[model samples]
Target: SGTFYDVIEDYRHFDFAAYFAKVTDSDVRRILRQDRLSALDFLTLLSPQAEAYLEEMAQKAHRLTVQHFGRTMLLYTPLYLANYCVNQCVYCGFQLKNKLERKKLTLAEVEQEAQLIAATGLKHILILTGESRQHSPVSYIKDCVNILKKYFSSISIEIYPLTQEEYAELIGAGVDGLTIYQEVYNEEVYAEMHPAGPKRNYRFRLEAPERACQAGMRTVNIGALLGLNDWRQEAFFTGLHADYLQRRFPDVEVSISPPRMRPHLGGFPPRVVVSDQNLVQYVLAFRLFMPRSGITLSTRENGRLRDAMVRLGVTKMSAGSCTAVGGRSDQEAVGQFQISDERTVAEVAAMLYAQGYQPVYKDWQAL
Candidate 1:
C-alpha cells in the first residue's frame, strides 16, 4: 500500500521526549542560552505548563520580534482573482463538484481589482485563485502580476503549486513571495481529501516550497489547515516542517498561519475543532519557539481575538480583505466568510496605533 509517508518516513510522528531531552542537555542549554533555541525549549514554551509563564514569554517574544521585525506589523490583503477550480477538495467551497457560480477574472477585471486594492492604502497584495491552470493559467497569473506590479510594492500568490521553472518565471514576473498551505500533514487524510486533480499528488505539494525557495522567492508561508486532522500533531508537524525548511533555506522568510475551518459554499464542516484558548497557545508557542518566524492572523479570526493577538506576538496581519471574487467593491459583496472585525482598514490601523504598534503598508520595493 503506497502512501504519502512512504516517500518521507523520517517526518512521521513527532518524538516530544527526544526533542525535550536534547533541549535539557547542559551543552545544549549553554548554546540555547546564547540566544539560540532548541526544539525542546520550543516544546516547553508550547506545552500546557508554558501558560503560567505568559508574562515572561510575552516580553521575550515581543523583544525578539522587535529586534528582527522592528515595531511594525506588516499589513497585506488577499485578492481572490478567480474562484474557478478543477479539483474536488472535500472541504473547500471552490471544489470542482460544487455548483456555485464560478467566475474567472478577465485581464481587465484583474486590473480593476488591483486598482481597487491600491485605493485602500495597501501596498502588499496576495493574489488568490482556485487550482485551475486552464482557467487561471500561468500566463494569466503573469499578466495579473504585471498589472499589479505597477500598483503594489509587494505581490504574493496563493495559487496552485508550480514547478521550479514556473516559479522562476513568476519571480521574474515581479512576485515577491509565495504561500502554499499543505492543508494537513497527515498523509492518510490528505490523500482522502484530495482524491482527484493535480493536488492529489501529495509529494509534489509537500516539496513545492523547496522548489519556490530554489526559484528565489524572498518569503514563503506554510501551514497545516487546522481541523482536518489531530490539531496537536498537525501543529507540531507544521513547526517541524518550517524548521526543516528554514535550515535548508536560511535566507528565505518563513511564516505560519493558523486558519480554522470556515463555512464554505458546499463542503464538510471542520472535523477537529481548535478552541480559542488552544489557538492562542499555538500562536504564542510558535512565537516563543521560532521568534524570528512571522506569525499571521487573518480576517477569519474575530475582532476580539485579532485585537488580543497583536500584543501576543502576531507580527503580520491581513486587513480590509475580501475572500470572494469581485467582493472588494465600494460596498462589500456577500462575503465568502462572515468577517467578525467588520472594521475598515483605517479603523484597524487606528487600533494598531493605539496599541503602540506600527502598521506597515509596504516593506519591499522593486530591485
Candidate 2:
C-alpha cells in the first residue's frame, strides 16, 4: 500500500480544479496583488504556473524577508541525540525493523554534545531523536533541553510528536520551537509506510502543528517530504495547512521546509524525484504564497543547489549537520540519511557571506 500506484489511484479522484479555483479566488488575488498574503494566496503562489514569474517573486520575497526578518539568515545545527526507534516506516533508515546499532545519549552525553555545538559558535540548536518514547521519553528530552538552555540561546526539537501538555512541559523546560515533518499527506501511502508505530496515526500527525501552537510553542515548522507524493498537490495542502494554523494562531511564526528524499543507509529510494528546476519553482512559490513564513533548506540538498537557493527564498539553514547519533562534533558513523552538502559550518557561513547574506548566530532570547 505504500507503493506509488496507491498514490496514483487516490489522486485520480481528487478535485484539482476545485482546489485551484479556491486558491485563485478574487480575495486571494487581491491579497497577492497588494503584496499582502493569506493562506489561499500562498496556495496560488506555490502552483506550477508561478514558475514563470520567479524573478519577480524572488525580488518581492527578498523585500518582504528583509522587512520582517532583516538581512540575516538564522544558523542552527541539529544534534541527533538518539537513533533508537520503534517504527517500521518504509522509507526511513531509522525504522525499527532495521537491524542497526542503536544509541541514545545519556544526560551527561547530551550536555557534552550541547557544549561541543556551542563551541562551534552556534547559538541555536535543534535536538533530534528517533520515534521511541520508551527509550527517548519526554522526561529524557526535557532534561536534555534543560541542560542545553544554559549553553544555547535557542533550542528546538524534532523528536516524535507529543501531546499539547507534553509540548507545554518542554516549552517550560526552555524549548522554543518544534519541527515536525508530516513526511507526506497522502493517507494511504502514509499508513503503509508507517505500518505499526505511533507515527502511523495519520490524523494525529496532521494536527501536530495545532497541538504545538495550543501548547504555546514560539515557532512551528511544517512540511511534507517532497518526493513522497504529487508535488503540486502536496505543496497545495502544505500551504493550506500553514494558512489554517496562521489564522488560528496569528502570533506564532510558521516555517516551511522542502527536503527532497536522498539516499539512506538501508531504506527505500525516493519513488518520485523532484528536479532542481522544479525545486526552485517550489521555493519561489512558497515565497509568493506565504511571504512572511520562513523557508528552510537542509543538508540533504547538494552544495550547488544550496548555493543557488539562497537567492530564491531560503531563510534558514542547518550547516555542518550530522544526522548520526552523537555525530554533531564527530564523524558520522551511523546516520539516518547521507548529507549531500558536506561543508563545515564556517565554510557555509563564508559561502553565505560571499553571496551577500549575513549568517546570523542568535535570534531568540529567554524571557
Candidate 3:
C-alpha cells in the first residue's frame, strides 16, 4: 500500500550530508561486518568514510554479483523516436524553447532505425521520447511499439509518465518494460529545474513505475538523475523506492540507472558533483543493499569508466546509443545530450567478451 510519495517528502528536509560527515571508520567496519545490510548500514557505506573501504566493498559487491547474476551482461540500445517536447527541463536539449529542429519519426522511419539496430545484432530495444504527449500521443506510441515489436526480442519505453490504462495499451501492443527516472527526488530542486513544463508535476513522475507495473509492464527501471540534488540523499531515496516496488510488485523486475548530467542544449553544469570514486561507491552500495536488482550504466559515463563498471555492479548497459530523433538515418539530428562513450556496439561486445562477460542481446522472449 505504501508508495514513493509516502516516504520521499520526509527525506527532503533531512540533511544526509551532515549525517554522512559523522560516519566514522568504526561505522564503516560495522556496516561491512553485516550479514544483511539495513538502511542505516547503507548510509554508513555511502558516507565519506566509506571511501577508505572502496576495495573491500567492491570485492564483496563483485562476489555477490557473480553469485547472483553470473558472468553475463544484458546489452540494450535506445532507439530515440521523437525529440519534439513540451517540457522545459533546463538540462535537456529537447526543452521546448530551444530553437533546434524537432522531428518525430514516422513508422517507416522507426522501421529503418529498428532494422539498423537488429543488423547490429542487438535484439533488445528501449525506445525514448521527449515529454510532449500531444506530439508523441498514446496512440502514436502504440503505433511505434507495434512497428518495432517484431524487430526486438523485448521492448521498453523511457518516456513521459503514463496512466495505468494508457500503459495497458502499450502492453497489449507488446511493450514488456518501462523506465522512468524521477530526474531528481528532491522536490525543491525538481521545481527549480523544471521551471515550466508538464514534467513539473512531482508526484505523478514519482509514482509512474508503480502504475506501469499495475498495468502489466514486466520489467521497470527507476533512478534519479545524479548531480541534481545531494547524491547520497538521491541514492537513498532511489533504494527506498526499489525496496517498495519489490514488496508490492513481486512479479515485476526492478533496475537502477545513475545517469549524471551530460552537455546539452541548455549548457547547464551539475549542482552537486558526484566524483568517479563516489559513483563507484554509490553503485556498490546499491549492489550490497539490493543484490538482485539490475544496475544499468549508460554512455553518459566515458568509455574507460563504463568498461570498469561491469565488475562493480553493472548488469545492464546501453551501448552505441544515439540520443537524437531519427538518429541513425541521414536526417542528421543532433542528440538530446552528447553521448560520452561513442564506441560502437561491436566495440562494447568485444570489451565485454575480453573481460570474460558474455554480451547478451536478448534475455527474454514472448509467447
Q: Worst ten-residue run, lDDT, model 2? A: 1-10
RMSD of candidate 1 to true structure, Å: 3.8
- Residue-level lDDT of model 2, residues 1-367, one tens digit each, is 4322333355558787686666533443354566556554665666655555667667776676676666667778889889888888777778888877898889888888777778878998998999888888999998888899999988999989888999999999999988998888878778766889888988777777888899999999989888887787777667666776787889998888988888786668776778888787777777776777888889999999898877677888888788888766556467888889988789889998998888888764210
Any runs in candidate 3 off by more than 4 Å, and if so which?
364-367
Off by over 4 Å in 1: 1-8, 13-34, 330-338, 364-367
Report lDDT (Cα) of residue 267, candidate 2.
Answer: 65
Tell me the lDDT of model 1 at 72: 76
Give the per-residue lDDT digits (tens) of candidate 1, residues 1-367: 2332443476566575565444433442343244656654566555555556566666666777777777777888898888888898988877888776777778898888788778878998999899888789999999999999999989999999999999999999999898999998877999988888989988889888888999999999988888898786677777877887788789998898988878777748787888888788777667766878988788888888898888777888888888778876635343345555666678888999998888888763210
- Ranking the candidates on lDDT from highest down gives 3, 2, 1
What is the lDDT, from 0 to 100, of the residue 227 in candidate 3?
Answer: 84
Q: How many residue pairs clash in each candidate?
A: 0, 1, 0
Clashing pairs in 3: none
* Alpha-carbon RMSD of each model: 3.8, 4.8, 2.1
lDDT of 3 at 309: 88
- The TM-scores of all predictions, comma-separated, are 0.89, 0.89, 0.96
